[PDB]
Design a protein around this ligand. Structure first.
Ligand SMILES: Nc1ccc(CNC(=O)NCC(=O)N2CCCC2)cc1
Length: 164
């Protein structure tokens, strides 16, 4: 069925624990496949070692720029960017996993995990999964953000991969 993947996350070099994500390949197979492969690193690049570079309390935690390591970069397994697959899934609440972007059809590798319902992003960001386990870890990450998005600890995905 739908892939289960994980992110193991450090803050200032010490482990917070594991976030487990279900990828909704049934609804958004291309977007789910991209994220899955970036977790395993099987194409020779991916999320391992990359950061949560911008985190805003009571909103979301954003990550996945493994090319420029500053929020301007990332790439997909298909090429630098790929289209918005569909907007069928909605930003319904905490734990939603969705693609960051720079406008229409600019999905790469950057993603975010919501910590609240973010309805204004519906129709603009492709939702492609949800947290299965580890919301406690997500709340810790969230607690290290700020209004400007700047993090107060260095938040690193030390390991990631596929569970099923
Ligand atoms: N592929 C790609 C994706 C994102 C960017 C830079 N864009 C962003 O940080 N956009 C903000 C964004 O998507 N957000 C922030 C609310 C969580 C969703 C640049 C390239």
């Amino acid at each position: 069925g739908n892939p289960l993947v994980y992110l193991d996350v450090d803050a200032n070099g010490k482990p917070l624990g594991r976030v487990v994500l279900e990828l909704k390949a049934d609804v958004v197979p291309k977007t789910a496949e991209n994220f899955r492969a970036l977790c395993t690193g099987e194409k020779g690049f991916g999320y391992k070692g990359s950061t949560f570079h911008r985190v805003i309390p009571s909103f979301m935690c954003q990550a996945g720029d493994f090319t420029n390591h500053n929020g301007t970069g990332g790439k997909s397994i298909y090429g630098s960017r790929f289209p918005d697959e569909n907007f069928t899934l909605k930003h319904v609440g905490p734990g939603v996993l969705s693609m960051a972007n720079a406008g229409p059809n600019t999905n790469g590798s950057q993603f975010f995990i919501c910590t609240i319902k973010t309805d204004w992003l519906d129709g603009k960001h492709v939702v492609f999964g949800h947290v299965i386990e580890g919301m406690d870890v997500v709340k810790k990450i969230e607690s290290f953000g700020s209004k400007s998005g700047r993090t107060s600890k260095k938040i690193v995905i030390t390991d990631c991969g596929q569970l099923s």
